[PDB]
RNA sequence: UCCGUGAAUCAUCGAAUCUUUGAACGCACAUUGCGCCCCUUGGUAUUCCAGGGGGCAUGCCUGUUUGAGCGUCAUAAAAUU
RNA sequence: GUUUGACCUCAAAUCAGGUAGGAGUACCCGCUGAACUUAAGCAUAUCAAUAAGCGGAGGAAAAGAAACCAACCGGGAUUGCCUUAGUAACGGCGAGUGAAGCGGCAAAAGCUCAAAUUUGAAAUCUGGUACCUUCGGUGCCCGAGUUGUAAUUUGGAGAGGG
RNA sequence: GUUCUUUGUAAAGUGCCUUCGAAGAGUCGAGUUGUUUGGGAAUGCAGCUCUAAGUGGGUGGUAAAUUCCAUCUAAAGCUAA
RNA sequence: GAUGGGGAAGCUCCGUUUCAAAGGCCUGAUUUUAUGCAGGCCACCAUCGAAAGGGAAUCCGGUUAAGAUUCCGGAACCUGG
RNA sequence: UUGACAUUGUGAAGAGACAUAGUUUC
C-alpha cells in the first residue's frame, strides 16, 4: 500500500517537493499556541512504527520546543568558587530536546499517557515535535491485550522517569563495551563498585 | 444589610418578559407558543407595568416567572429538542442521499405524548368534564373545512373518526335535551353525568379558509383535544362498559359514513326524553339533511331508514315521512305528515306536540330557543 | 478569530508561494460537467449497506444448511473498491479501470505518488474534486481514493467512453504537466502596484 | 433503613452512586479488572492451546 | 456567488449556543441528608443566673444558651415552635466562654413566668 | 429476671456518622465575608420574608448536543414561426 | 447554485462519563549540582559524576530477549555473588584513581508490533438503551472507523502455490 | 475426586516441490563545542552545522588508505524470579 | 495578584487589558418551509488592598456588683418592598 | 563588539562555466 510511498518519500527532506511543503507547515505551526491538538498525524505511518493505531484512546499533540543552549540561571552571571567553569552559554543539558517535549506536554494531559514521540520540523528558533499519548480509562484500551499493558500503575509518566526510546538513548542505555559505564543505569552500577563487602567470615 | 439595588424585589422578580423568557427557555418563539397551550400559561399583569418594567412605558406582556421556572422541567421540552435532530439528521441522509439509513430513522423515533400532563391538568375524570365544551367545538370545526395546507388532509380523516365515537356513545345512551338551531350551526345541550355540556355542530359547508391566524398553531390546539378526548371516551366506554374505540364498518362507512356503521360492544333510561319516539320508526324523504335528523332519532328511541339509502339501495314498516319540501305527492293514509321543526319543539320539552300543525307546507314557531 | 484569521492566510500563502511542479498537478482538476457524469456512473456501483450487508447474511444462512452452497448461491460482488492500500494493492497488479484522486487531502503527500504511478502503471485516471463526495458514493464521511475493476456487461460502453474521454483530458496532455511551478500570483494591492510601476514607466 | 431501600432500586443496574460502591482503596478502584488480564490476544490464544504447558516427570 | 452577511459592528464575539441542564444517571449521594439544625437542636439550655430572673419581670424577656450556627431568625422560629409563644424581638450576643447567649423579649400579650413554670427551671 | 438477644474505656469489625478546614474545588479569606441555581416547607402570601434539602473549580480524554469560518461554493456561449 | 446539503476546521456547554494534582519519599528512575577536604600553598586534579535542589514510580523499581561477547573445538536475554583485580588503564604519570571478557554459583522464561489486498463482501470496537445468570452477556440504536479497525507473519523465520 | 456439558470436519502441528521473502531517516554517520568516563586521538551523552545506503548497516579498544574475514541486525514494544 | 498567553529541566517566572470567539438586550403573524429560529441593538473585562480616607439613617431620660448611641421607657429616622 | 553559517524565498542588470541550445561559480 502507501505506506512505503511516504516512508521512502519521507527521507529525502532536501527535495523541493518537500522544503515546499515543509515551510508551509513551519508558518502554520508557529501560529497556534506552543502546545495545539493535532486531529490526525502528518506521517502515520511514522506513527504507525511507532504504534498507533487508529481508534478512540490516541491522541496526537503538535508540540513546539525552544532551540539553543542550557543557560544556567545565577544573578548576574556569577559561579561563586573554582573559576574553572567555562562560559555560561555552554552548559549542554544531557536530555535531549525530543525529551522536553514529552514531558511538555505529560504534565499537561496527565490522564493521558506518553508513548512515544518523533520529530516533524524544525526552525533556527524553534523545533517541534509529534507526541502520541494513550488513554489508560478508555475501555477500548483496557481490552486489546496488545495495549492494556500501559494501563499498569507503574508506567505513570514513563518520560519523566525517561522510559521511552529517546529517554533509553539519552540515558544511554544499550549492550556492549562502549556501554561499560552505565549498562543497568549510572547511578545503580556507580553505587555497587562503590561498596564494601564484608561476608562474615571474612575472606 | 448593605442598601440593596431598587429592581429586583418585587415586580421585577414576579414577572419577566415574553422576550426573556424565551431566551431563558432557550428554545425558540413558536415553541413557546406551543407550550402556553400545553401547559397552558396564559400570560398576566402587573398592577404596575413601570415598576415592572424598569421604567419602560412600553407595550409588554409578563409571565408569573415562577410558572416557567415551573415550566423549565418539562419531559416535553426534552422531545422537542429530541425532534429538532431528527430534522437535522434525516436531511443529511438524503442530502449524501442514503435512503436504508434514513428510513431506518423514521421507525426508529417517538411522537411526544399527553398522557401525563393532563391527569396533573386534570384530576382526574369530573374536572376535565366541565371543561369539555370548549375542547369539543373547534373539533367539528376542523373536520368542516375541506383539505388545505397547512392542515394535511391525514388530519381531517382522524376528526371524521372521534367525532363518530362521540355521537356513538350519546345515540347509544340516548342523552340529547336542549336543542337549537341557528345559522351558526347547530346547538346542543347534555347532561352528562351531571355537569351538562352544550356544543355544536356547524353546518356542513366548506367554507374559506381566512388565513389570518396561524394554522401551526389550531394543529397543535387539535392535537390537544384529540389526546384529551381519548382517554375521556376510553372511560366513558367502560364507564358504559363498552369496548373502546368502536370499530367502524367499512362499507357503511361507504353508505353513509355514518350512525349506521361504528358498532359497540360492552366488555332502563333517563326518563321521559330518552325512550320518547319508541318503536316508532321513520322514513324520511331524500331532500332531508339525515347528517342533522338521524343522530337525533336515534338518541330518542326511534328508527329512520332514509331515501339516500335507495339510490345506492320495501317501505311498509315506517309510521312517519319527515318531509322538509313544498309539495308532497303522493303520501300514504297510514302514514303522518311534519316538517322536521317538530323534531325540535318536542324533545325542546319532551311534551310531545302533535303533528298536525307543522303538517307541510303549514306555518311554523321558528324556534323560540331553549335558553 | 485567529482560526479564521490562520486558514485565510493559509489560502493565501499557498498561492504566493512558487508551488513545485509535482503538485499543482492538482487543481488542473476535473471540470464539473464529465465529473457529473462520472458519478452518476458510481452511485449505480455503491459498496453494500449494513442493513443489506445484514440482510444478505440471513438469506444465506436459510440456504446454507438448507440448500446446497458455500454462499455461491449468493451473486456475484459489483461496487467500487475504496481503501487507500487496496487502492494501491489493486494498482500494480494491476487491475483497476478508473482510479480517482481527491485533489484536498491535508497530508497531500498521502496522495502525490499516484499520478506518476498510474502514468507508469498504464492506469487511466482523473484528479475530482472533493474527499467528501467521494465518501458519499462510498458511505464514509471522506474516501481521498476511488476505484472501479469490474462492471456489468451493459454498463460497458459508457465507461469505456470516459475512459477514452479522460486521459485525452488528463493523462496525455499532463507529462509536460511535470513543468509548470505554480502559484505565482500576488494579491491585488500589490497587482495593482506593479502595473503603475510598470505601465507609467511605459507611457504617460 | 433508607440505604437498604435505596440499594434495591439501584440494584442491578451500571452507575449506582459512589458512596454506595466499592470503597477498596485508590489503586483498586484504578488497577484492571479479573475480565481485563484475563483477556488476552487471539494469537497466543492459539498457542496455548496448542501447546499448553505440559505435566510430566522424570523416573524411568 | 456569495453573499456574506454584512456585519456593521466591527467587533465579532462569541455566537450564542444551546447550554443544558445536567441528566445524571445516578443521584449524587444516595439519600437526602436530613435537617442538620431543627428546634432541639437549636437551643441548647436555658441560662440560670440571678441576673437572668431580673430581665424575667422586669424585661418579660427570656435567656438561652443557643448554637452556634444558628441566628436570630433560626432562634424566633425555634422558640415559636416549641412553646408556642409570639416574640417581640431577639438580641444576641456571644458568651466569652464558647457559647451563643440569645436574649428573647416576648411579646406583651404572653407571661415569661408562665413558660418558665412551664419549662421546670425557675 | 440469674438461665439471658446480654455488663464492658473488653475483643473483633464487613454498617453508618463524620464540625470547620485542608491537594481544597461557587468567589474570597487578616473576614465565620459575598453570590448564583434548583427543589421543598412556613409565616395572612402571585410579588415580601424565613427555614430546609441539592447544586455551581481547573486541565484533559471519550461521547452527545449546539455551533461558527467564502477552509472547501463558483463556467458555459449561442439562437427561430 | 442570492440556494440546498455535506465535508473540513475550531469552539461551546453546571452536557453524558471519566481522569490529574497532595501525602509519604528507607530503597528506585531521572535531571540539576557545590565547597570545606587531599594535592604545598593552587587556576588541572581531588573530594565527586557525591551533599543540598527539582521531577516521577513501585512492593520492588530498573534492566531484560544481542545492531552481544569472542577470535575459541567458539559462547548466547537481563540481574546478583565469588573471582577476575587494586590488575589493563588514566593522571602537574604527582597526589591518586580504576574497569570489563572468560570461570563458578544463585535464579532461570520467553515474547509482541511496524512493514505483505479480507476484497466474494470491516470480518473490528466505544457508548446509549432493554432484558440478563452482571468484574460480564445478549439484543437494538447513535456512533467510531478505510487518511485503516480484526484475522494472518516478526527474522529463530515466514508467505503463496502444488 | 465427583458431575454436567462436549465440540469439530473446527483449529493447530509435521514432510516434500516451487516461487518469494516486505524488516523502523534529521535517524545512521561525520565535523564542532561542552560535559563525563579507565577509555587512551575521543568512553558516552547533549547542543549547533552537515546529512547516508540496501548483497546494506553496526562492531571487531591506535591515527589513515587498500584487500579480507568474523559476527550481529540499529534507530518500535512487553516480560516473573 | 490569577486567567488569556509567553518563558522556564523544574520549583515556578512574566505581566493586569493584555496577539482570546473574554455577554446581554430587544421585536416577532420572520408569512410560510409546513413539525429544525428569525431580525436587530449594545459595544468592557477576576479578585485583594484603610476598625484614622470615601461611606444610607438615633436621640434623651432611667437602670446593674459589673454592660450600654446596643437593655428599658419615651421620641425619631434610613433603606427596600 | 566584529565575522561566518543557519533561519532565508522570488527576480533583474554589470564580473567566472556548459566550449557560443538555459540546469548555474563573481
Redesign the pocket.
Given at each position: 500500500?502507501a505506506?512505503?510511498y511516504l516512508?521512502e518519500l519521507?527521507?529525502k527532506?532536501?527535495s523541493d517537493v518537500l522544503?515546499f511543503l515543509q515551510?508551509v507547515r513551519?508558518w502554520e505551526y508557529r501560529q497556534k499556541?506552543?502546545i495545539?491538538?493535532?486531529?490526525?498525524?502528518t506521517?502515520?505511518?511514522?506513527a504507525?512504527?511507532?504504534?498507533?493505531?487508529?481508534?478512540?484512546?490516541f491522541?496526537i499533540y503538535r508540540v513546539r520546543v525552544?532551540?539553543?543552549?542550557?543557560?544556567?540561571?545565577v544573578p548576574k552571571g556569577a559561579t561563586?568558587?573554582?573559576?574553572?567553569?567555562?562560559?555560561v552559554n555552554?552548559?549542554?543539558?544531557?536530555?535531549?530536546?525530543?525529551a522536553?517535549a514529552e514531558?511538555?506536554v505529560g504534565?499537561?494531559?496527565?490522564?493521558?499517557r506518553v508513548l512515544?514521540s518523533?520529530?516533524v520540523n524544525?526552525?533556527?528558533?524553534?523545533?517541534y515535535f509529534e507526541v502520541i499519548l494513550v488513554?489508560p480509562?478508555?475501555?477500548?484500551i483496557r481490552?486489546?491485550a496488545?495495549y492494556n499493558?500501559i494501563c499498569?500503575?507503574?508506567?505513570?509518566?514513563?518520560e519523566?522517569?525517561?522510559?521511552?526510546?529517546?529517554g533509553?538513548?539519552?540515558?544511554?542505555?544499550?549492550?556492549?563495551?562502549?556501554?561499560?559505564?552505565?549498562?543497568?543505569?549510572?547511578?545503580?552500577?556507580?553505587?555497587?563498585?562503590?561498596?564494601l563487602?564484608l561476608?562474615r567470615y571474612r575472606? | 444589610?448593605?442598601?440593596?439595588?431598587?429592581?429586583?424585589?418585587?415586580?421585577?422578580?414576579?414577572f419577566i418578559?415574553?422576550?426573556?423568557a424565551?431566551?431563558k427557555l432557550q428554545?425558540?418563539?413558536?415553541?413557546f407558543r406551543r407550550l402556553c397551550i400545553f401547559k397552558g400559561i396564559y400570560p398576566?399583569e402587573?398592577?404596575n407595568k413601570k415598576k415592572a418594567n424598569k421604567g419602560s412605558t412600553?407595550?409588554?406582556t409578563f409571565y408569573?416567572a415562577?410558572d416557567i421556572?415551573?415550566l423549565?422541567?418539562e419531559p416535553v421540552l426534552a422531545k422537542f429538542?429530541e425532534?429538532?435532530?431528527f430534522?437535522?439528521?434525516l436531511?443529511?441522509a438524503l442530502?449524501?442521499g442514503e435512503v436504508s439509513?434514513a428510513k431506518?430513522?423514521e421507525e426508529?423515533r417517538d411522537s411526544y405524548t399527553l398522557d401525563h400532563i393532563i391527569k396533573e391538568r386534570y384530576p382526574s375524570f369530573p374536572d376535565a368534564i366541565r371543561d369539555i365544551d370548549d375542547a369539543l367545538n373547534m373539533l367539528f370545526l376542523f373536520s368542516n373545512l375541506p383539505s388545505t395546507?397547512?392542515v394535511?388532509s391525514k388530519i381531517i380523516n382522524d376528526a371524521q373518526k372521534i367525532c363518530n365515537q362521540w355521537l356513538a356513545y350519546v345515540a347509544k345512551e340516548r342523552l340529547v335535551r336542549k336543542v337549537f338551531v341557528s345559522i351558526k350551526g347547530v346547538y346542543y345541550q347534555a347532561n352528562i353525568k351531571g355537569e351538562e355540556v352544550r356544543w355544536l355542530v356547524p353546518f356542513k359547508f366548506p367554507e374559506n379558509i381566512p388565513?389570518?391566524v396561524?394554522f401551526?398553531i389550531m394543529?397543535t390546539f387539535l392535537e390537544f383535544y384529540s389526546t384529551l378526548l381519548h382517554f375521556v371516551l376510553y372511560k366513558l366506554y367502560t364507564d358504559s362498559g363498552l369496548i373502546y374505540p368502536p370499530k367502524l364498518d367499512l362499507k357503511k362507512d361507504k353508505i353513509i359514513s355514518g350512525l349506521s356503521s361504528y358498532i359497540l360492544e360492552s366488555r332502563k333510561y333517563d326518563s321521559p326524553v330518552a325512550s320518547l319516539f319508541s318503536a316508532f320508526v321513520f322514513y324520511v324523504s331524500r331532500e332531508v339533511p339525515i347528517d342533522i335528523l338521524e343522530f337525533l332519532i336515534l338518541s330518542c328511541g326511534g328508527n329512520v331508514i332514509s331515501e339516500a339509502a335507495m339510490d345506492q339501495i320495501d317501505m311498509s314498516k315506517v309510521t312517519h315521512q319527515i318531509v322538509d319540501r313544498p309539495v308532497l305527492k303522493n303520501k300514504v293514509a297510514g302514514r303522518t305528515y311534519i316538517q322536521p321543526q317538530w323534531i325540535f319543539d318536542c324533545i325542546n320539552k319532551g311534551e310531545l306536540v302533535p303533528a298536525n300543525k307543522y303538517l307541510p307546507g303549514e306555518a311554523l314557531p321558528p324556534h323560540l330557543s331553549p335558553w | 478569530?485567529?482560526?479564521?484569521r490562520v486558514?485565510?492566510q493559509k489560502?493565501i500563502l499557498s498561492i504566493r508561494?512558487?508551488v513545485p511542479p509535482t503538485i499543482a498537478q492538482f487543481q488542473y482538476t476535473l471540470?464539473?460537467?464529465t465529473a457529473a457524469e462520472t458519478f452518476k456512473l458510481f452511485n449505480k456501483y455503491r459498496?453494500?449497506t449494513?442493513a443489506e450487508?445484514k440482510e444478505?447474511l440471513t438469506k444465506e444462512a436459510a440456504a446454507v444448511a438448507e440448500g446446497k452452497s458455500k454462499?455461491?448461491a449468493?451473486?456475484?460482488?459489483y461496487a467500487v473498491?475504496?481503501?487507500?492500500?487496496?487502492?494501491?494493492?489493486?494498482i500494480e497488479?494491476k487491475?483497476a479501470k478508473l482510479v480517482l484522486i481527491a485533489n484536498?487531502?491535508?497530508?497531500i503527500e498521502?496522495v502525490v505518488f499516484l499520478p506518476a504511478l498510474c502514468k507508469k502503471m498504464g492506469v487511466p485516471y482523473a484528479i475530482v474534486?472533493?474527499?467528501?463526495?467521494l465518501?458519499?458514493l462510498?458511505?464514509?464521511?471522506?474516501?481521498?481514493?476511488a476505484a472501479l475493476?469490474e462492471v456489468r456487461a451493459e454498463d460497458e460502453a459508457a465507461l469505456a467512453k470516459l475512459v477514452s474521454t479522460i486521459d485525452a483530458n488528463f493523462a496525455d496532455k499532463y507529462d509536460e504537466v511535470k513543468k509548470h511551478?505554480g502559484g505565482?500570483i500576488l494579491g491585488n494591492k500589490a497587482q495593482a502596484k506593479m502595473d503603475k510601476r510598470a505601465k507609467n514607466s511605459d507611457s504617460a | 433503613q433508607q440505604?437498604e431501600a435505596v440499594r434495591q432500586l439501584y440494584k442491578?443496574?451500571?452507575?449506582q452512586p459512589?458512596?454506595?460502591r466499592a470503597?477498596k482503596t485508590r489503586?483498586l478502584?484504578?488497577a484492571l479488572?479479573?475480565?481485563?488480564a484475563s483477556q488476552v490476544?487471539?494469537?497466543?490464544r492459539?498457542?496455548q492451546?496448542?501447546f499448553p504447558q505440559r505435566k510430566y516427570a522424570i523416573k524411568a | 456567488?456569495?453573499?456574506?452577511?454584512?456585519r456593521?459592528?466591527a467587533?465579532?464575539?462569541?455566537?450564542?449556543?444551546?447550554?443544558?441542564?445536567?441528566?445524571?444517571?445516578?443521584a449524587?449521594?444516595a439519600?437526602?441528608?436530613?435537617?442538620?439544625?431543627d428546634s432541639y437542636k437549636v437551643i441548647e439550655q436555658p441560662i440560670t443566673?440571678?441576673?437572668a430572673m431580673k430581665?424575667v419581670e422586669?424585661?418579660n424577656?427570656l435567656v438561652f444558651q443557643v448554637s452556634?450556627?444558628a441566628?436570630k431568625?433560626?432562634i424566633k422560629?425555634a422558640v415559636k415552635e416549641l412553646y408556642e409563644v409570639d416574640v417581640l424581638?431577639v438580641?444576641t450576643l456571644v458568651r466569652p466562654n464558647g457559647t451563643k447567649k440569645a436574649?428573647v423579649?416576648l411579646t406583651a400579650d404572653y407571661d415569661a413566668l408562665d413558660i418558665a413554670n412551664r419549662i421546670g427551671y425557675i
Amino acid at each position: 500500500g502507501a505506506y512505503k510511498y511516504l516512508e521512502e518519500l519521507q527521507r529525502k527532506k532536501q527535495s523541493d517537493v518537500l522544503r515546499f511543503l515543509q515551510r508551509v507547515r513551519v508558518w502554520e505551526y508557529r501560529q497556534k499556541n506552543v502546545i495545539h491538538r493535532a486531529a490526525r498525524p502528518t506521517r502515520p505511518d511514522k506513527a504507525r512504527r511507532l504504534g498507533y493505531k487508529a481508534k478512540q484512546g490516541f491522541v496526537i499533540y503538535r508540540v513546539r520546543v525552544r532551540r539553543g543552549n542550557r543557560k544556567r540561571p545565577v544573578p548576574k552571571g556569577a559561579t561563586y568558587g573554582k573559576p574553572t567553569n567555562q562560559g555560561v552559554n555552554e552548559l549542554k543539558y544531557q536530555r535531549s530536546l525530543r525529551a522536553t517535549a514529552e514531558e511538555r506536554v505529560g504534565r499537561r494531559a496527565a490522564n493521558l499517557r506518553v508513548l512515544n514521540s518523533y520529530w516533524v520540523n524544525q526552525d533556527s528558533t524553534y523545533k517541534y515535535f509529534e507526541v502520541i499519548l494513550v488513554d489508560p480509562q478508555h475501555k477500548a484500551i483496557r481490552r486489546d491485550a496488545r495495549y492494556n499493558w500501559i494501563c499498569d500503575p507503574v508506567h505513570k509518566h514513563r518520560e519523566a522517569r525517561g522510559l521511552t526510546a529517546t529517554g533509553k538513548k539519552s540515558r544511554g542505555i544499550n549492550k556492549g563495551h562502549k556501554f561499560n559505564n552505565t549498562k543497568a543505569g549510572r547511578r545503580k552500577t556507580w553505587k555497587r563498585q562503590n561498596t564494601l563487602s564484608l561476608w562474615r567470615y571474612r575472606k | 444589610m448593605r442598601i440593596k439595588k431598587k429592581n429586583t424585589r418585587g415586580n421585577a422578580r414576579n414577572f419577566i418578559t415574553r422576550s426573556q423568557a424565551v431566551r431563558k427557555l432557550q428554545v425558540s418563539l413558536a415553541d413557546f407558543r406551543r407550550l402556553c397551550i400545553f401547559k397552558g400559561i396564559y400570560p398576566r399583569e402587573p398592577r404596575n407595568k413601570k415598576k415592572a418594567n424598569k421604567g419602560s412605558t412600553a407595550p409588554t406582556t409578563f409571565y408569573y416567572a415562577k410558572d416557567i421556572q415551573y415550566l423549565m422541567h418539562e419531559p416535553v421540552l426534552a422531545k422537542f429538542r429530541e425532534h429538532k435532530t431528527f430534522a437535522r439528521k434525516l436531511t443529511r441522509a438524503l442530502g449524501r442521499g442514503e435512503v436504508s439509513s434514513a428510513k431506518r430513522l423514521e421507525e426508529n423515533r417517538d411522537s411526544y405524548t399527553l398522557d401525563h400532563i393532563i391527569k396533573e391538568r386534570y384530576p382526574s375524570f369530573p374536572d376535565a368534564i366541565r371543561d369539555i365544551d370548549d375542547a369539543l367545538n373547534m373539533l367539528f370545526l376542523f373536520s368542516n373545512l375541506p383539505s388545505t395546507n397547512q392542515v394535511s388532509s391525514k388530519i381531517i380523516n382522524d376528526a371524521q373518526k372521534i367525532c363518530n365515537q362521540w355521537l356513538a356513545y350519546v345515540a347509544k345512551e340516548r342523552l340529547v335535551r336542549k336543542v337549537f338551531v341557528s345559522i351558526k350551526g347547530v346547538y346542543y345541550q347534555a347532561n352528562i353525568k351531571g355537569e351538562e355540556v352544550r356544543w355544536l355542530v356547524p353546518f356542513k359547508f366548506p367554507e374559506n379558509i381566512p388565513s389570518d391566524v396561524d394554522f401551526r398553531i389550531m394543529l397543535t390546539f387539535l392535537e390537544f383535544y384529540s389526546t384529551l378526548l381519548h382517554f375521556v371516551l376510553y372511560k366513558l366506554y367502560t364507564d358504559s362498559g363498552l369496548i373502546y374505540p368502536p370499530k367502524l364498518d367499512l362499507k357503511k362507512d361507504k353508505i353513509i359514513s355514518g350512525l349506521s356503521s361504528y358498532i359497540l360492544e360492552s366488555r332502563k333510561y333517563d326518563s321521559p326524553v330518552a325512550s320518547l319516539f319508541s318503536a316508532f320508526v321513520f322514513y324520511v324523504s331524500r331532500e332531508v339533511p339525515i347528517d342533522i335528523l338521524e343522530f337525533l332519532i336515534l338518541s330518542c328511541g326511534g328508527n329512520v331508514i332514509s331515501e339516500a339509502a335507495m339510490d345506492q339501495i320495501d317501505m311498509s314498516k315506517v309510521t312517519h315521512q319527515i318531509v322538509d319540501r313544498p309539495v308532497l305527492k303522493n303520501k300514504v293514509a297510514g302514514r303522518t305528515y311534519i316538517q322536521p321543526q317538530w323534531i325540535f319543539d318536542c324533545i325542546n320539552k319532551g311534551e310531545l306536540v302533535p303533528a298536525n300543525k307543522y303538517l307541510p307546507g303549514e306555518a311554523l314557531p321558528p324556534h323560540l330557543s331553549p335558553w | 478569530p485567529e482560526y479564521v484569521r490562520v486558514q485565510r492566510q493559509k489560502k493565501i500563502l499557498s498561492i504566493r508561494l512558487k508551488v513545485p511542479p509535482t503538485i499543482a498537478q492538482f487543481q488542473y482538476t476535473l471540470d464539473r460537467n464529465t465529473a457529473a457524469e462520472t458519478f452518476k456512473l458510481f452511485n449505480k456501483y455503491r459498496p453494500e449497506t449494513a442493513a443489506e450487508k445484514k440482510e444478505r447474511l440471513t438469506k444465506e444462512a436459510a440456504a446454507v444448511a438448507e440448500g446446497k452452497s458455500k454462499q455461491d448461491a449468493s451473486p456475484k460482488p459489483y461496487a467500487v473498491k475504496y481503501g487507500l492500500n487496496h487502492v494501491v494493492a489493486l494498482i500494480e497488479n494491476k487491475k483497476a479501470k478508473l482510479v480517482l484522486i481527491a485533489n484536498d487531502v491535508d497530508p497531500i503527500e498521502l496522495v502525490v505518488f499516484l499520478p506518476a504511478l498510474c502514468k507508469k502503471m498504464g492506469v487511466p485516471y482523473a484528479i475530482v474534486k472533493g474527499k467528501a463526495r467521494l465518501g458519499t458514493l462510498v458511505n464514509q464521511k471522506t474516501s481521498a481514493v476511488a476505484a472501479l475493476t469490474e462492471v456489468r456487461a451493459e454498463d460497458e460502453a459508457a465507461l469505456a467512453k470516459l475512459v477514452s474521454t479522460i486521459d485525452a483530458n488528463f493523462a496525455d496532455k499532463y507529462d509536460e504537466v511535470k513543468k509548470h511551478w505554480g502559484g505565482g500570483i500576488l494579491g491585488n494591492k500589490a497587482q495593482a502596484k506593479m502595473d503603475k510601476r510598470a505601465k507609467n514607466s511605459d507611457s504617460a | 433503613q433508607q440505604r437498604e431501600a435505596v440499594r434495591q432500586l439501584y440494584k442491578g443496574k451500571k452507575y449506582q452512586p459512589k458512596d454506595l460502591r466499592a470503597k477498596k482503596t485508590r489503586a483498586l478502584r484504578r488497577a484492571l479488572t479479573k475480565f481485563e488480564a484475563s483477556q488476552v490476544t487471539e494469537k497466543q490464544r492459539k498457542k496455548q492451546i496448542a501447546f499448553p504447558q505440559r505435566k510430566y516427570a522424570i523416573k524411568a | 456567488k456569495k453573499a456574506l452577511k454584512v456585519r456593521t459592528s466591527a467587533t465579532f464575539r462569541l455566537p450564542k449556543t444551546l447550554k443544558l441542564a445536567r441528566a445524571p444517571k445516578y443521584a449524587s449521594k444516595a439519600v437526602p441528608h436530613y435537617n442538620r439544625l431543627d428546634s432541639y437542636k437549636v437551643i441548647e439550655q436555658p441560662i440560670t443566673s440571678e441576673t437572668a430572673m431580673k430581665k424575667v419581670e422586669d424585661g418579660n424577656i427570656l435567656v438561652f444558651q443557643v448554637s452556634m450556627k444558628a441566628n436570630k431568625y433560626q432562634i424566633k422560629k425555634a422558640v415559636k415552635e416549641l412553646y408556642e409563644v409570639d416574640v417581640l424581638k431577639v438580641n444576641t450576643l456571644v458568651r466569652p466562654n464558647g457559647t451563643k447567649k440569645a436574649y428573647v423579649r416576648l411579646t406583651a400579650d404572653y407571661d415569661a413566668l408562665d413558660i418558665a413554670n412551664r419549662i421546670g427551671y425557675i
